């Protein structure tokens, strides 16, 4: 079908100021035309912003639809039937904020992408990632510490719904597991490249795998023309993946000036997730996040808004992200806030948008309202460009969300 | 038995021309004499040509005896007694349009190779690749796309008769896989180096194989004293087998002029199967032929006749191949027709002569009728030097056909 | 409930082994032993009652309609299983022949029965078993 | 289509005469009507008799089709491709002597039964019962004797074309082997009740299963309306399958009158086969068969002849059969007239057409010409019914061959 928009400030991202006086046109889920001059509006559905903004479509590049609760290892030993029933809200939820997009890090898998694509559920268009590539004892190894070590899964064969990574050592194992995933369906590879906090084992400083096996992977990746994404946050462990071939690095709290100089020489983007870890300690003891995790959150947390600043000062591009389990789901919006302490709402909402759309290899097809683009689109209750707080909690302030070229919510008429 | 052909034109391969008045001596399944002057076998069975052309025996360097279906994966699941009877016809239909001798590009094994070679059954002389190895989700992996990954053979033990090739993946099992089907019998060895047109899954620019796995695989061959032939259609994909040691290029359809160089440098040689792109579009998805499979073909079809030129430019020794499927494995001769759109008639017929016969290493053993040749002999109503529309159809103009010095088809009598 | 197709080879009833899927309207089981483990699984797992496949069925890749479906030992032991955790056995059944053998090994419901006689409907009677009749698909199969 | 036959004697099987003054008409496959007066039909394909005898195709209730050669443990070592090929000729050649139906003891499968069925070649319909289920060290468990066990089958998931037999050992084994057997599409089941010849290990006398499995195999087979048949020589052997609800009982050879009388005494058939015996004691030795086979030839082959008068003295039902191997697969007719030594021609033709169509639960539909019947008809230049030398050989005086209402031999002009 056909749409119009007019009588609203037009935010484009990659300019400081709202564009003012123009009309976009929607035709078949995309973006027909965008112009100063007034459009001839034959079948189009008329919608009038009254001086609201209209923006791109939010992004957010690390998200995990099917971590449905704190304690991660449990999730995986969870009926099928019920991880996914339990995911619905959350997707939805998550549209309603204004993620139209949203890249999965590991968990969701291809059956999720078309339930959505197909209509069956909505929620943000998913970029996914399958199972999350680990050694044996690394950040994605569910399995608990004791004498002896049961096998990774039951059964090897069959993926588990709750399940948001997978064990694979060695180069031809690690070969294998990305083969699979992609033929499974991923448009991504995850891994872990170092210890992580809501892993039952490893510590946060911890190595994530040879390179050996790092430049396997990132050879796998690439030779089916995608990329891998790689948790780290030392300087070292975030160094040798990007030197390994790594795309983008998440988190990264504990990067330095050297570390976020080399990233940005190589390309390397860094989604960083700060509002996951102000959640952790709020309400991870409350909400049974296992006290071996809770113990390595304060070795990470501290460094979180100053590796930003360093970031910003070698000129890394940051991408948004998020990267809530549980009930903590529900803050994704808050991330905005967050970075707004150290960056100009400008440069989050860039973030959030043509960064992260780069990131997917999505450029002008994404994150920008311009011809030939995907009809994702928002309007908003205030001007981002000024402050960010208009995009914060349930989408409030958000009365008309478009994915698609379809209206998703539309209080205004 | 002991023949001699007399009163007919002699077509060689490397003369523009056909020769006329020669006497030919066939002495148990090899051509013992060949000259202008007239020679005396009082024992022979004498042949009147009657001016006609006779010419050596047609050779395609890329067929699948197996593929009896254009569903593949269908076909792998189907009983073994089924395929090989199904399979008796196809071989059968083959000679009779002249093609003394196939090189089968993955599926028929040594045991058919053997079943003509003693007389069980009636087809062309076999050039057999056994299974072609492919990677996890590569062309040769038949398995659908779902939330887990069963096995790639019901039971890996024993070769089912329909499938076309293997997963192997890293180098040890590439190694293993290679030295098993040389232990069975096979000429050479096929690999899927790229995404296909007639798979399950991926995408047509992906790659197959690490070069790791490549040099591994081509070390094996050669180990053997044979070589490799790699499924490859783009110059990324083409470059790296042929820099990996791969011995002949399938298809090549998006070859440029950058990568016919190196080829030709490395004397490496293409075998393009234009006429199979045409069978696809046409009357692929009318018969079985799975839907996401047919969304490929766009992608290489346009491409395929141009690839000729680009190939002569550069000095690329061209055999001749068509890859045909299902029904569609009647249309075998048009790839002559295809070819002389583009290129001489005199060239396409040395494509299926003199060339493929060097790539079979068989040079003045095949393809040319010369002293000490197996009896590789046809008779054609025409002179293909001028015209190809006389080996096209089901051999209507081709009235006499010869393998191994014996007479299959003889209309002359 | 054997979803497998006719072919020269049988593939695995279970690709999974351990893990179930969600799709799996049934599971392939042979021998007392076989059976009694797959029963109580299925009870372990939450099960309310126990279906078996007493006959041969139209919705289905290889098996006739007439075909018995398990010996007299394998429904008994999954009757008895049933029973101890205090349920019981529906079985799928079209021939009086197939129902009887059933309501005589002691499952407790039949469903279909679209071919059965009146002896045998006597025997369900009697034995106090029940029938669950489903015309309705067989309409919209058709 | 449509066909008359006039002017032909017509052999009966249940009248001891020739009935004269006939007339034959099949439509579509079938006998649709057969009388003295003349038939009314216009465009029936009018076949002239001259004088030549008309009789129901002939049907052998025990063959294997796969039996290529005397080694049989080697057989099911070849390839696949091999094994089918090879039985293609076999299959044929059995048409041509005039068995338009067979019973194959052991081997072929569904596969070749519904090659035939699609005309994708050419013999007998085929009642098959897939492999033959034998214990361990049983007559059909073709391992050696050895300090080790290896296993039954290299691979236990995939069925080899060669293999005649299956090893099951334990009621739930059995019950396992045959609800596959029959799922795969077998007809019958055949069991090994007792020692063998063609065999490895196993003596003449010894047992083969216990009761129990006997019985869950017999309860398997009925539970689908079907039947078993036992592989047994000795009157214990014999007794023992009879008393468990086996139906018919293969060779038989060492039955003695208290056995013979229970056979009957319990409706079940016997299916003698001395041809077998001759050629083994004739050109098994010469043929490849092993030593140790032959070694136990003499424990069977004097008591042949001996066997019929007591098992027709005992009113016993006794098919025909032949169960010949490899070259000598030949020699299939010459059961008529080595039958004939004790039994009237009557009798004899009567085994080979009522009483076998009896065992296949096929009485009215063949082994009769009759309305309704299939239309399975031969024509032989003699009276079988005064000698049977008429169908020895290669079908010589057969100048007829009718399957299905269709022609497969036709010399009569
Ligand atoms: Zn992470
Ligand atoms: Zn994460
Ligand atoms: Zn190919
Ligand atoms: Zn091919
Ligand atoms: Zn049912
Ligand atoms: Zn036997
Ligand atoms: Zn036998």
């Known amino acids: 079908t056909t749409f119009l928009f007019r009588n609203g400030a037009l935010l484009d991202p990659d300019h400081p100021d709202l564009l003012q006086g123009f009309e976009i046109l929607i035709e078949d889920g995309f973006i027909r035309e965008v112009s100063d001059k007034p459009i001839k509006s034959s079948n189009a559905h008329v919608i009038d912003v009254k001086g609201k903004t209209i923006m791109p479509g939010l992004i957010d590049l690390h998200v995990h639809v099917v971590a449905i609760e704190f304690n991660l290892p449990r999730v995986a030993t969870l009926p099928n039937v019920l991880v996914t029933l339990r995911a619905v809200p959350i997707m939805r939820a998550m549209l309603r904020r204004g993620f139209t997009t949203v890249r999965d890090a590991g968990g969701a898998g291809y059956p999720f992408k078309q339930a959505v694509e197909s209509g069956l559920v909505e929620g943000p268009r998913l970029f996914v990632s399958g199972r999350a590539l680990s050694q044996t004892g690394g950040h994605a190894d569910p399995r608990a510490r004791s004498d002896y070590m049961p096998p990774d899964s039951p059964c090897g064969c069959c993926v588990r719904v709750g399940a948001l990574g997978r064990v694979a050592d060695g180069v031809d194992e690690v070969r294998r597991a990305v083969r699979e995933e992609l ?231």
Chains 1, 2, 4 share one sequence.
Not at 384 to 397: A, I, M, R, T
Request: net charge negative.
């Open 183 to 413: 033929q499974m369906g991923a448009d991504q590879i995850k891994i872990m490249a170092s210890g992580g906090v809501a892993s039952p084992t490893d510590p946060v400083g911890v190595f994530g795998y040879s390179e050996d096996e790092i430049r396997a992977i990132v050879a796998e990746a690439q030779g089916r023309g995608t990329y891998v994404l790689a948790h780290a946050y030392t300087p070292a462990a975030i160094a040798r993946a990007v030197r390994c071939g790594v795309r983008t690095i998440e988190h990264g709290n504990l990067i330095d000036d050297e570390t976020a100089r080399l990233v940005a020489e190589h390309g390397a983007y860094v989604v960083p997730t700060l509002v996951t870890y102000d959640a952790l300690a709020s309400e991870g003891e409350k909400y049974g996040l296992p006290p071996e995790s809770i113990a390595k959150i304060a070795d990470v947390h501290g460094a979180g808004l100053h590796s930003i600043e360093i970031m910003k000062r070698a000129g890394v591009k940051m991408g948004f992200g998020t990267d809530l389990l549980g009930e903590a789901q529900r803050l994704q919006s808050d991330e905005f806030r967050i970075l707004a302490e150290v960056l100009s709402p400008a440069e989050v909402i860039a973030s959030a948008t043509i960064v992260s759309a780069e990131v997917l290899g999505m450029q002008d097809k994404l994150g920008r309202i311009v011809p030939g683009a995907h009809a994702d689109v928002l309007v908003v209750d205030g001007n981002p460009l000024k402050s960010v707080d208009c995009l914060l909690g349930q989408g409030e302030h958000i009365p008309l969300v478009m994915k698609d070229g379809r209206l998703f919510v539309n209080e205004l008429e």
